[model samples]
Target chain A: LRIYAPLNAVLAAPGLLAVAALTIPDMSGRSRLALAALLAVIWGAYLLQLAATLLKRRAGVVRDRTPKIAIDVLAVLVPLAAFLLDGSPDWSLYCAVWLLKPLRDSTFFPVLGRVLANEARNLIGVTTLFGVVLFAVALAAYVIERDIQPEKFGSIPQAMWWAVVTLSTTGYGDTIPQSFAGRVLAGAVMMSGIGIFGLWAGILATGFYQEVRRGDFVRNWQLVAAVPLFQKLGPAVLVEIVRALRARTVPAGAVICRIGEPGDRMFFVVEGSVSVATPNPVELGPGAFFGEMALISGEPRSATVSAATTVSLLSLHSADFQMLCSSSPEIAEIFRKTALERR
Target chain B: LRIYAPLNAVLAAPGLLAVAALTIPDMSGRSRLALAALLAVIWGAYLLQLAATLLKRRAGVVRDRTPKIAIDVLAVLVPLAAFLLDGSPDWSLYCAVWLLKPLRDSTFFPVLGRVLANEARNLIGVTTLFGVVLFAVALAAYVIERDIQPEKFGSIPQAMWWAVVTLSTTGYGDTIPQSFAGRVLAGAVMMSGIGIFGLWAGILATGFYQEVRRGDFVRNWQLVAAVPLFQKLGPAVLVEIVRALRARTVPAGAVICRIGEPGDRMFFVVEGSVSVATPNPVELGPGAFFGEMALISGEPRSATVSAATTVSLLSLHSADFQMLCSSSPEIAEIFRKTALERR
Candidate 1:
């Protein structure tokens, strides 16, 4: 049975109260104080829950053995309870609370980090520039339309209704300024909305591409050098082989190249150690590669490349060799011969 | 003596007027029809300017040439005269006209294509989702609040004001729904706004990272395969190296490795070729790499590597080598020594 947590609106309630305070007309100071107190109480409760969770972990009571089931159940229950108890709490606040899930998930965190680092910052900057333009236009709208639409243009804050809709490109027709100045502001808002957002997307895409390159490069470096067969070549040739060969790391005791498997890739020990688990198995150390002959000659692997320890190796696929080494005929011949010899 | 061309707004005033019909309240049928006629006239004038500009460009007229200069001056003067005559058209459209500089100069159009592929699609999806939620909330707001605040909710379009504010989390509280149903509608919009926007950002960030990886992989795949040291590695190891070795591409005439610069990375040729440009230059084919020894040894580069054509190479930095090869002492030893011995 999945138990749902009620959202504790107490956390976001304070912010809403503040927003309310800003909007309400001629409210008594007593009413404002009461709302603020209510907000504070709710905030305190939210903070208490957060503190308790963190403290439990520090105290070692929140062990890794804590069933994920319990946590999931708690999440739903908390929100559900909060919604039921609160007198129609802000729905946006509830949604904000749910954002905790994605933020906490480690599986997606690295990807998230890259985006924030690369794209979000730039988008924020551009948005701020948009904000500046909106502010200028909104001020103009208020000044021009106040006499005609007194309530809507009551103040700068009131005019913000027009500015925000324009900036976000929502363009709902209400609250429009009818004056010539108002029309000018509205027009500027629309164009700025599209232009700024377009640039934001462009910057983010560029940043994202760079992040992927860095990640892949970091992941592939170690095992390429561990392969034995490719070690003797000069840097030029070695780099070509690195490009051609694929690499995989198997944990200790994992079977790498199974015997009798049709070979497509040549293997080299880039790290740790591995052996051909045959009756007369030979240990392959760092710099030694195997299975190339099988890949080149279309034969089964003579021996299993099982890790004697935690093995890391570079493997060259037949197709990759043919493509990356087309210009280096000697290197091609060496790889071809090595494949033949491996069989 | 800074002189400027006329603004694009004046030049494109007819198009702007046609668009204005969609924004403003309805007029009599005859008046609307008359407005349409005015649009045609304005459009014709703009088209004439456009044709003249295109003709000059196709004529092979050089900069500062009489024909080119005269046409350019006319284009500027015509736009300025048109907009100024039209009482300096809407600022938003005018500013959009200004964006022609950054869009053209930044190579923005091509980059924008990549971003659209990488990010814009997802944002558009979220926007659609947000739109659905926004429309529903606005309808509710109008149904409940229209009788109570008839002027504020003058039409369905007017009620959209409350919806837009609540949906953007920008709640410019001037135009909120006062009735119970309206509040409920506002609540939903606010919640939808937060959830949709957050999801949009998350998706965009993820897409950005993936796009970055795709571009990097395409750029560096060949350079990774040509390294001689990886020739002997297994397919798995080669794959690992490809991941570790960040692929980078430099265009023709770009200097890759500078002499007397401390080397920390080894390169492998992937696609086009490069050369060791020095006192006595040596050209390298697609399978060659330089500076591996120096990279390993922490020594300065012996010669500069520059793009012979448009070079692509996979380069492995030292930190990555250490991380990838730390398990195998022997492999690590050889790579380390290779770096030292190259000197």
Candidate 2:
């Protein structure tokens, strides 16, 4: 039977460190390189497991959310254990291993990294909530477990690891509820686990969405300004456009726009080139706008456009365009007046 | 001059229970809303100041290196004040105010609910790192400051608040060192502050990059699978191609590929339609690869391919493609053989 996976990183740290220390000294330079490579191989295996967890969650209507939940929960506890052990040798090793994980280029590294990233970003919005939950749960777990098992919960500091692991649902089974009341409290913690998971995932998703929105806003700023049809629009209108739009790139010679399709969208070019191929055709470059007339009139696209070269364009859909116009009535009026003068 | 940003949430929280105990009620909802709005505005201003500190460090020639050393020295005193007050109403108020920030999002109601969500994800990372740093620095500060200022330092718990604001870089300036040695000892905590800031920024940047990358990767996976050239490449090669390529959505009539540029890159349409426009030639659509001729011979674009409607393409550049091919010799040989067959 395997020794480590079941124990969680904290408990397994001593074993990993011991193995490394013992084996490393015996190996020659080539052999040491081989050993390091072997460790990378082992690390790769864990990455595969982590990746499977991510894929399972993202592949839609996941059959079991437990695996993903467990890894995340485990991620939380790795540091907790180190703290409980007070950075003692292998305990430090455990924390290091956690950091080293889901190693770069491993199957799951990308997914897990994003999850962690969004989680961190979202923390700005939820620090208090987490502080309260952590304070209460850690306090409760310490009070409950401390009396029942003095050895593990001898101090609040030691009891913290148990609280973190149980709350995160990263049960290593090395530390468990031996007393009846403790077990009951543990059950309550497990239920809290699902709610915690939801909160974590929900916050992370929202933060990621905002980051993407901000990124899109920055990318679309120039494109919105360049369009003559939109020149009359004030900064507010452009700001609205920037917030609502998404940027896309096209390679040379690709069809950039089509005729007779829903013209519920408008495009503003940021860079590269585009050409109109229609009954009456022309070319448009960066800062130009197309498809607005179709949107306003509810008509089909009247012209086809092909990329003259690589093109970066920002697309704003009708619903958003309408929303922008209505939100700031003054700016919309300016745009209308501006467009009329040019027409 | 404003001393602290007014925290309406804290003031509103059982306002009667607050030690200061002052209530100003107004019938107009706008009045209460305005106060909340003002508090949010002030808090935002503070965040800008905090961001400015970060920006100033970043603006340096070295980029966040050699951060203004004086700021760190000021930060050491904030928590000293908090501790000297013995967890004063102001101290708790400061922590409460610091934590209430997540409530500013107008969308989330029951005010604290969404704020909790933000805390659970983001603050978990920052604060865990913060907690570890806070405790470790408090421990260090205690070791140094206890003997030096026994009345002030007393114990680790007393040193905690001082460590916190110092690490959080919030300089309250109430409790400061008069002794030379105590001030010198505070330098360690400031250095720790720089480190914590670095960790936070690095985590955010890495996380954002991976989120975008994974999103791009999954999109490309579908495109790669649909490509005829990729279809015959087998599972290993397909996966390699998926990793090396990215999915791009091109608006209809945008160019997908160019004729004359050296075939350093290749693309395959995943969805919608595309057209090939060559001198004295007509157009073609999906499943076609343009610029492959450049791959055959070092030449510029011979023709241009544009999207007929909205199109998704999986694109891989020559360098990345070659890198992926070389990852496995078997794959590399297969690629060469395939290119030869096409020639």
Candidate 3:
């Protein structure tokens, strides 16, 4: 799927470019023609598959089609214009803007997008501060340095060039202060630049960490809330429990709970599947849990559990579990009864 | 104190230089000597006040003496060196190093220091990664560009100059790639530079936020634990309560709670003092709490409470207060009894 995701981007953009190239003049080189024809054939196959998938939506094929179709339609029109105006096959390269289309589904991009969204206010605030300082210092530099170095600091606009380079700590040293007053102003600006950088970095880093925590909280809260054992607990208590739960990812075939290992935590599956190593392997999907018996009984894991596929699970360590139970006797009684019954 | 903190840096370095100029070759110039003499008199007065403060430490003239004394001693030594060696008064500028010494006590630097300490590992890791990339790219550029642009990329060391400038995104444009292959390599390095910058900024930002949170948590936890109502709660539960509490700083004479206002939270004083407006104004200090009766009984505030001095407080909002009391019934019972008694 990961490989095919990028393939769609290439097919949508490069494939359309090939079709457009065929329409242009002097596009008769054998390799170019062959490559163009080859991409055309591949697109033909992809279109058929996409059509079939759409027709059989009930068969469980799901995709975000709006952006996909939008890129597909754009891929043809953008290159067609280039072919008509310039008649160059190289014009097809312009369709590469469609490459960003694949990023919508990328694992990292969504996380990055969310982090940026969460910190948008802080990012804007810091950027505004940077801009204000940039303009202010540029004016100061122009006022101080214009007399000393007339060519470089003749105007505020020219001085702004120096301001940006210095503030970003680039210090290209293309133009430098030549007089005592200008040097003093430059030193003060340089020190201010360091402080500004620290503050900007601090705000961004803080925002990213908070967003990550908030994302985890929302996700784990939903997963925990879905569990029957915890459903009876109010939102406030569930939130507290969510705080105690740590989310972890396990790849397919990775051992989660090895039999005979002393368990200090219980895992609740949030997504994907896991299987217990037993005569008849018990498969647990989202909302199902394991290792609770070990936590409750203070014994070794009764059965080994490994991920059947790439999985996410929330684990509550023994200490937090014990605290939760201690603070709510009713929950403790119910949990203990369940553990004993299962045993 | 905050306003006067930067005074030492100015006084120690620039002020010393002005004093040193009086003893230089042009000592016959009256304005120069007069200006220098003025600074010397100001320094003399400052020294006297510093000496008197040290002698009166028992009278509550508290200050971090070591750095204070260190900078003062350096101020004298640096100017003395300039006056004696080569008779050049300008050498007193070396005392600028003393500027950073005063920064130790500045409100922002300590927080910045704590943030840096918290993120030392990540910051170090990103920096190490940047250093590795820098050298690798420099070597590549040296091997590729050295043959084509020998003057700029003559050796690995020369190539390194370009690498640092480019990676820092300074792009002085003093040296640039001329060959196609060299350009491509430069492009790749430029992209990698962006990633490195993001990682560095991200690590620092994350560290700052974590340090801030950790500092607040540790400080508030101590204050919370000291309150008898929370003492019985285990560390885990106490931590939850601490998270629910928000810290605020109040300036002297600022109103904290106004008379007849509906209360939605209770504040615990961590430092300084607050006074309740009653027939005889009741004073509250560290570890003391107010607005509790209103939160517990759902009544209007009986009196106005204003900060008698600058104070730090931890406030538990109504929702969190109710949640905490519900989670620990003993706290609810004890708190209700106390509120009723106080009323």
Candidate 4:
């Protein structure tokens, strides 16, 4: 098995444990040697990974290889070289290099990286606001309490330490402002901390929401376009439909439309299949639409529908369909025809 | 004259300072009495406020007054009763009641209160996740390093202390996991801390944004409806414009558009007046529109426009206008006619 493969993740825990066990003081020499052997085994596995990487990339389409190669190379050598030197017992600490093994392969990290990059400016702005408030609060505390608690609040820097602890609400309890004025300021400062923290969270959340929503919109657009029904519609109307459609991913065996349940929306199956509960149960696959009969007739759902497999769906609600009906007669006419044919 | 009045905010500072001074040891008897007198003066001011509040509200339309009245009553009575008792010097701490004085009047708190309430479920979810992770981490650390650092990692509770400090990244440095496995776990815990905190921020920010955005949309809808041209247009198109419009409030004499500068957005004078930089120097009051010329004619701004007074504006961007034109030819025709007439 190649060490850089996703399955190599299984080795990471034991490898880290072996590193941990080696760091244990006064261990039996044999036990320490066994841990050493484990590291050697992990090292050899990564060595194979490094070789495969180099050979594969040497004559293939060039890609983002530098960061991955560096990680693979360092994952192989860093601890082995550290082990050979045997300079300090802490040389085993370099075993932490194994952490980078997951760095190149993670989905979460990249998404987080994108979120941070997208919100880089606003986050920096909040941080600046935090810094400004920290200084001002510190300065106020220094002026108010310096005379009384000279040891803690004697200087601006000393007060800043307290300010940060209070601002972060960490409550290290190493310093306390005894003056009433300082206490009042501390309360105000703590409130500002809550506000600033909230603002920072709001900004990041907004960016993340926008990013996620944008991704959904783009994906939904492609899925909507894939449908011959939408493709037949005007571009403006398609844009409107894309905006109106809410994408939902449902699991296998999930009840999508319960019979006699008042249906307010129609579904477009973008992926997987839905089983319609009827005398002749119908299965709808990708690009197929369902529940239009209920929307047209203004009645409860006629047939219960459940996902035959994990299903990706685009739902168009009744209100939006009504609006579309008012704006574009073609869609309504087609929908009515589809309902008639299905019935 | 009333303490509950906004002006009573001025006395809060000095009254709190007196509370701090009274807290000081080895002060002259005269100094203590002088400080007590200051509290009495502040107390008298609040008593008058309490009187005015009860009298005014007794005969007027009923308000949401119980909370405000409670604050006022406590402001007058808590310290007075505590000062009379003189059981513990800490009773003087009741002077912290003044903190609530601003609660009824301040604008920032209500918005914050709404944000917290709106995002309550999501915030609770994140907090529960934080707690679950905290316990899991503590349990893991206890299992990994309990034998080595019995004092610090001896029990789950003991390890939780370390977990929270690390998870909060407060890093009090009181107890650290010396074992490599524990250290790895610690790194993961801290990363989780950053992530959970970010998610919390995101949730609150999203709620606050939605609230602010909802407020703007409702306000902009009213403003848009006031415009005669929009009133003549269909309701569906008005909803579309409301979504597209971005509101801006500019101070007096601020430039709205500069001559020869290409404009992408047309502004509606929702409030105040715009000073047109023409030979006649036209002052267009509330309900007027400009920058439509640039959007319609596809040319640079003909005249520089500045806010004659502090102005509230709803700007419709060119992209949105183009989309509106595609959807509703009436809006396009009106915009074109308006541009021609203005020129």
Q: Write the per-residue lDDT of candidate 3 for residues A1-343, one digit (tens) a residue.
A: 1232234455555554554444566655875667654644554565566567556546455545654555555544554455458565565455444455566444444455676776677677877877788889878888876766777888888999987778877677678887878877777887897778787556556545554566555566666666666766677776667766776668788788778888878888888999887666788888777777777788877678888877888888898788767777887777677555434
Tell me, by TM-score, which candidate is best: 3
For candidate 4, the C-alpha RMSD (Å) to the true structure equals 9.3
The per-model DockQ list reads 0.03, 0.02, 0.51, 0.23
Q: What tens-digit string does per-residue lDDT give for candidate 1 at A171-270?
A: 5655555444444444344334445445456664554554443333333344443443344455544444444555456767767878887777677776
TM, every model: 0.37, 0.31, 0.58, 0.55
The TM-score of candidate 2's chain A against the true chain A comes to: 0.46
**TM-score (chain B) for model 1?**
0.50
Ranking by DockQ: 3, 4, 1, 2
Model 1: CA > 4 A from native: A1-343, B1-127, B179-185, B222-338, B341-343
Cα error of candidate 2 at position A118, Å:
18
Order the candidates by TM-score, highest first. Answer: 3, 4, 1, 2
lDDT (Cα, tens digit) per residue for candidate 1, span B1-343? 0012124423443353343342223357766556545544554564576668656556564343443344444534454554556553232222222222222222223444676666676567765775576567657667776677778886766665555445444455467655666566556655665575554355444534444455434443444445555555666555555545554456676667666644556676777877775655767667665676665544657577777667656666564454445535576677666444434
Range of the 10 consecutive residues with the lowest summed lDDT in candidate 4 chain B:
B1-10
Enumerate the chain B TM-scores of all models. Answer: 0.50, 0.46, 0.64, 0.64
| Residue lDDT tens for model 2, A1-343 | 1222133544435535543442433456755455444444445555566667667546562122332356554654554555466633333344344444344213343333333432332343344455445545545565566556777766555656666655554444456544456645554554344345555454455445544543432375434556555666554345555667777677677676665766678777878877776544567777766666665666766566777777788887889868756766885565455333322
True contacts kept of each: 0.00, 0.02, 0.83, 0.17
Candidate 3 structure quality by residue, lDDT tens digits, B1-343: 1223244555555554553454456456656646654644554565575577556656455445554566556654554454457355454355344454456444455566676766677677877877788789878888876667777788888988888778767677678777878887776886886687777457555655664567555566666665666666677777667767766667677788778888878888888989887766778888778887888888877578888888778888888888778878887887777565445
**Lowest summed lDDT window (length 10), candidate 1 chain A:** A1-10
Which residue pairs in candidate 3 collide?
A205-B205, A205-B206
